[PDB]
């Protein structure tokens, strides 16, 4: 599980 | 201590669009390409006169240079919804002034219509 | 400031269409075989001044060869052309090169594979290696799509002038002149015809 | 005025010749053009050669003498043997004497090199005719005269160079097999004496121009001479030391040593091995001491382009790569040769940094050779660890664009770079990871930040996917994404932030193994792509769509199953929100999206679930479709509304996109629209026809009619796409074909030429290919509807209707493959047109027509043969055997169809073998024109002899008879057959060819 990266990717832009 | 260290711009761009330019060879009833590149409307700051200046990609050679005369008229071409045909009485892209029947095509009908709008605005600027 | 350029290669490879594109900007679709040679001056504007090429566009069909290697005398540069959709034209590149460097023993030469715009390419990039041992510059080009169409002349200009930083630059654009009723109905005839002759390649992106 | 030299009754005014020539070469415009035409007419006069001796003696224009020799050249190469033996001796004597007198005049020898080279080549053309049989002393006399003058010795090296070229390098095409072998043996017989001169000059000579000419001839010798002359003579020492120090000789010497590195050598002899080591050692020593040290910045040197540096660095790369690919093992075991081995490779590292696309590809080919060997060969890789570490950086920093971020040169180069870098990663995974992370740090700290540089690094990172372990990959990918994400935040402005986002999505698109194992992340990726499908910045939408389908292709299975913490398979979720997701996309991009969904849906193997997903995916286009059908039918004038036309086309294109990825599974959706679609096809057809009637042919150019025809073409493409992939052919035949043929065939036949869609032919080709065996009456109907009317479009020139041309012969080819019976049902007049059409294809230069034309001819002959001894086959041979033989011979010999030589040869061999296997049961001759009982073999031999005598009247009866004897005797051996044809093609270009040449195979 990689919660931090998913959130970090989710915020791009 | 001092150490010696080691040893068309008079115009403004009203409109710019990509386009392909054709000239009509009447004796062969054939349209012929003249250049593909950026078409620009240039307003001389000293005369306020607007011209068309178009250069070919890469070689940067001039393929259109003439005033947007107020008497010119843009007409559709039978085979295209994104081009305009008009007659030109004095273009100086290749030496002596000379008259041509031009066609200019664009990437979309939207660019073609915008070009016609800008083309007419410039004619009125050239009217005064 | 002019340099003689000889342009050789098999018939139909696009030598004349390539030059025409540079002379007028037009793309000629018809194949009208060159007979012997056609000489055309071609000028480019550079940051080192203008450079003039006297292009000797020779014939590739043997029955129209004319003087053949006679056209190569005193050339200072050359382009060898083949067609990436026709293997035989690449197979003949060594023959044209042979005839060329027997007359012109030490000149910059560009090898051009034309017609890369065509989807069904037959002479694959990995097969094109003849230029290596012969010190020729090679370019994929297309006279139709203008892909790399300036590269052969830019490279030759740099070799002939001896300046690797030479660049094509924009020729200056003079103010154009200002704009009789005796030809009003005359230009209306020509305009009617032009409007009703369809523009070519209406599916091209531009 | 200038046209006076064209009057041969009067003496030739040399002065008038020199003016025409000068105006051509130094003139311009109209004068030059007119002179050019005059000079060509002069040179082509069959008697112009007689005035060559005058020009060579009494002219003062070297261009004029050059043209005189060109005239002589034509005469020697084509008509030599026709001459009186008087003229042969005379021409030989005044070419020999002209060369001697140009060599004896130091001023001429110095300033007229073009004319001397032309004269030497002309001499060589005489040697190819006369030597050694009628000139046995040429070589001994050449050697004798070399010592009496330096200029003559130098020129003799040019003559020997050209002779070697003409005999060994360019003979395969230009002389018969027999004549080539004769000259190769003759040169081989006397080369001992030639080498002795060449070596003496090299050991003693002072004149650099003489040395250079001698080495230039040596380069040609090395293409063919036995190894003993190179390895048993100390010539390698001279090449690799003496001649590498002077720049005058350095270029040619290096090219000679490159060829030596490809000499046929025994690999048992330890001394030859040491000699191969030694000359490499000497050469690398001279480079380090005389040109530049190993540390030199060759990138900067190459860019400065001083003198011949660029050519030299190119030649050095060729020398090092050639030698090392063959012999580096010689250097890998002896510790005393390790420094030489690594210095050679360090030079290659330095050469690999030069900015020159084509040179990089030469060194990259070598690097591939190396790292592949280090990957498989035990105990080698540790030797090159420092070389490989530098190479990793070179390739990462010069990575070019992959096709997933139109240029086929860049695409090939990326794949070659990827291959080498993958090998390099396996060789040291840790070093590769470290370089890439480090490069990334300098993107974040701004010291190497650049749009090009971040793209380059991301391509490199993406290229090594599948080489790390899954654990290392996971840690690596995360670090890269994190670092890239922080890098995107770090920036401002649209453009900057856009680059980094693309590179992010690119890297993730390259690591499907990672995505497959991290569902939560994969879902986040997709949903971020969907967000990007609303961004309007130029190029973001295209990137998002390309990435979406790229990921789907590789991870489709994870979209079709129900994941652990999900209520539905994710494909269901994509479909629900599809209108929102795609609202801002252009049509092309919408279609890519639907195609991606089609890929996923095809993974569902439960039929009822797959079909439910299919109809759910197609809900929007199907509702727009239903609406238009209900309207277009109630008001056919709507189709003149260009907006409805565009809408209809995009609906069909959406069906094509989904059908492209679903294939056989698309059938339920095809059934939903099929019948109304073909009704739409008919209505659109009526409108195109009505528009052409009312406006003329120019209507076909108008946007309205082009829009209408797009509808027809997309419909045809949809049916073609489905049928080419269908697995239930009963349904194809019984449901799809008959409505299709009724909708398209008569419309094609009864439209004017400019209104017929070539796509109809393409569609019919697929129908015949897939189900032609099951619809013999359907095939007959296709032929009846398209054959004659299409043939009449394309049989007036090779120009018009290029698409119909290609598709026409693809259709005839498949029909002839799968449903030959359809041609048997043709009336004899139409079958005659069929034969005419095949032969018409022969005469196309257009490869896409010529190749099928020859294949139909071949397949047709086999079809006829299979019928056995029945009336139709016997009538076929009587009516058409000799038409095919003579038409095939025409294209073999006319010099304008050389691209099809191999298949012409095959066809001809098949035709001849039919007769010499007595597979033709009836006589091919009239009951009148030959004695009863004459074998078809005797008649064939007579027919062909008479045919070739009249087509090539300058051949002797003996030539023709020997050629045909060889050809028929060899009709079971394609390679030999072809050699005999090539020999014939040489002989027809000249007079007096030797008929015994055709016994070469014997
Ligand atoms: N698709 C494509 N066609 C090209 C391209 N360049 C030339 N052609 C076409 O190829 C055909 C031959 O062109 P041409 O210039 O006459 O070749 P050539 O080498 O001068 N023939 P010759 O040696 O007999 O004079 C023309 O129909 C031309 O339109 C190209 O880049 N792409
Ligand atoms: Mg030509």
Residue numbers in the entry:
A (entry chain D): 456 to 468
B (entry chain B): 63 to 69, 80 to 200
C (entry chain A): 9 to 187, 190 to 216
D (entry chain C): 0 to 376, 414 to 441, 457 to 1053
Reproduce the article's own wording on this structure.
The chromosome region maintenance 1 protein (CRM1) or Exportin-1 (XPO1) binds 8–15 residues-long nuclear export signals (NESs) in hundreds of different protein cargoes. NES sequences are very diverse but each usually has 4–5 hydrophobic residues (often Leu/Val/Ile/Phe/Met; labeled Ф0–5) that bind hydrophobic pockets (labeled P0–P4) in a hydrophobic groove formed by HEAT repeats 11 and 12 of CRM1 (9–16). Here, eight new structures of CRM1 bound to diverse NESs show several different and unexpected NES backbone conformations that share only a common one-turn helix element. All NESs also participate in hydrogen bonding with Lys568 of HsCRM1, and mutagenic/structural analysis identifies Lys568 as a selectivity filter that blocks binding of non-NES peptides.
We study three NESs that uniquely match the all-helical class 3 pattern (Ф1XXФ2XXXФ3XXФ4). Class 3 NESs from mouse diaphanous homolog 3 (mDia2NES: 1179SVPEVEALLARLRAL1193) and the cell division cycle 7-related protein kinase (CDC7NES: 456QDLRKLCERLRGMDSSTP473) are indeed all-helix peptides, both forming 3-turn α-helices that occupy only the wide part of the CRM1 groove. CDC7NES is far from the protein C-terminus but structures of longer peptides suggest that CDC7NESexits the groove after Met468 or Φ3. The mDia2NES and CDC7NESsequence patterns should thus be Φ0XXΦ1XXXΦ2XXΦ3. The Φ4 anchor position is clearly not used in mDia2NES and CDC7NES even though Φ4 is key for activities of several other NESs. The number of Φ anchor residues necessary for CRM1 binding can vary between 3–5. Because most previously studied NESs have substantial helical content, we also study five NESs that match class 2 (Ф1XФ2XXФ3XФ4) and class 1b (Ф1XXФ2XXФ3XФ4) patterns, where the hydrophobic residue positions do not suggest an amphipathic helix. All eight NESs bind HsCRM1 in the presence of RanGTP with dissociation constants (KDs) of 670 nM-20 μM, and were crystallized bound to the previously described engineered ScCRM1-RanGppNHp-Yrb1p complex.
